[PDB]
Design a protein around this ligand. Structure first.
Ligand SMILES: CC(=O)N[C@H]1[C@H]([C@H](O)[C@H](O)CO)O[C@](O)(C(=O)O)C[C@@H]1O
Ligand SMILES: CC(=O)N[C@H]1[C@H]([C@H](O)[C@H](O)CO)O[C@](O)(C(=O)O)C[C@@H]1O
Ligand SMILES: CC(=O)N[C@H]1[C@H]([C@H](O)[C@H](O)CO)O[C@](O)(C(=O)O)C[C@@H]1O
Lengths: 177, 186, 180
């Protein structure tokens, strides 16, 4: 009842460009009014599996994984994460949603959120300190969802045959209730 | 699982230089012997609202927000944070009765000793460093230095020191969120 | 919300090169299926107490502290941390599998390969002597050690030619997925 997560099942569970090109491990543990979050990401196939900017000049240095939730905190099909790999550990989940007062949605006109809607972290590819990636977590940015967690990954380095196999990052956010 | 926080009320609640020039969002959630802390800061007016080191050569690149607590973990008036915006959680605002004991939320004095007469130099473990960012951009870093029990005329203290190196040009001091934990007094 | 930790007792409790050359402060607090961890490290004697790369050219810029656990989550004598300074918040405990890093989330290296998944690892920036300009990289790796059911490996490394800087680290918070 306490923890909402992606099962630890080894099989791919996430779409960046293409169905099942990635495995997201996301654990949301409710500790009162804060959610303790833990995230890692492995790309298993497609253009981001093996980064080589020396050989592929058209390769982006960013992708975005979105978790979209309805008014009851149910994950929506339009999410990048496959609905079938998201459940409580061994139903309503508003206690796990990012607080709308703390993290307001952008009025249609604006598009500009407060800064507090966002968390930045440094994560690393292939367990090496010298393969940094910036993870940008943004709450309630997506307009056609009551709640959202957006995971933006970006990097600067001209990586040469580095697998997108990320280290683990911990963060917290204020819970809706 | 009791939580001690600044209400989420949009109104300013904090003094850097001047009454109500800033809005601190601080949430302290007690998970047993550790406090899970979450902090963001917006400057709403004054010299730090909009940073421009090209146009204002006299502008510091640091300020300090202090939360000072008495022996009972009550926030003191001398704190930078307005006492009226600080209480236990009961929605998206605070409980009615202003609180009586919060020692369970205070930074442990054994883990984070106050500086003995002999030395004003604390142990390093009294301090947490984090990188936060202005205006949701990775290229506007600010160093947040959180220090416990550094202030001498208080039983307990949380000191939030903000500093940066870049000659920012028209960047609003509107910070991203940072999570940390510390060992609780009880 | 049971907590497993090193007592806050001021006495040294850890071996980097030599018995009691360091004091590790590690607090593992169980919040359901995640462990909330808090760590600081002070070196009290030996070659790493005071870093000077101008005066000592043979000094490494890394050391590793290992916590090794058996199938019941009991800390083993072969650990760098002294067994006597590790208990619930002194008659040693009996089961702590609820505090161990999950074997499904953080698999041990198959015989074939010593190469773990990246998710077994957490990187953090910590600082010596409470100064932003004395960075140290802490690399936390789970279940890397082959002769233990469970392990937490704390690798410390740095680049700067520090001149008379004490290895007195700031505090770092992380979490990991619990075995149960
Ligand atoms: C974990 C970490 O901070 N590693 C950093 C490494 C260093 O190898 C290390 O910090 C030295 O101790 O430098 C970078 O690659 C760099 O210069 O672009 C950034 C990267 O984030
Ligand atoms: C999250 C993070 O580490 N951000 C860092 C960024 C980005 O990494 C870089 O803009 C992408 O290439 O670099 C800095 O702006 C810089 O170089 O001065 C410092 C800042 O702390
Ligand atoms: C990010 C942080 O907290 N500390 C960083 C400091 C300070 O930002 C700087 O000394 C104050 O201006 O800069 C470095 O030493 C650097 O540029 O090589 C890296 C170090 O990680």
């Amino acid at each position: 009842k306490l923890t909402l997560w992606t099962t630890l099942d080894p099989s791919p569970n996430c779409r960046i460009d293409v169905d099942k090109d990635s495995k997201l491990t996301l654990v949301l543990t409710k500790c009162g009014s804060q959610i303790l979050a833990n995230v890692s990401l492995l790309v298993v196939k497609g253009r981001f599996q093996n980064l080589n900017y020396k050989t592929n000049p058209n390769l982006p240095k960013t992708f975005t994984i979105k978790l979209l939730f309805d008014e009851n905190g149910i994950l929506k099909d339009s999410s990048n994460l496959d609905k079938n790999y998201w459940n409580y550990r061994n139903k309503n989940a508003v206690g796990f949603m990012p607080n709308l007062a703390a993290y307001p949605k952008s009025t249609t006109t604006q598009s500009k959120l407060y800064a507090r809607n966002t968390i930045f972290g440094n994560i690393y590819l292939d367990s090496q300190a010298y393969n940094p990636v910036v993870i940008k977590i943004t709450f309630n940015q997506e307009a056609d969802s009551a709640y959202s967690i957006t995971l933006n990954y970006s990097w600067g380095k001209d990586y040469e045959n580095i697998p997108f196999d990320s280290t683990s990052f911990t963060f917290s956010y204020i819970a809706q209730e």
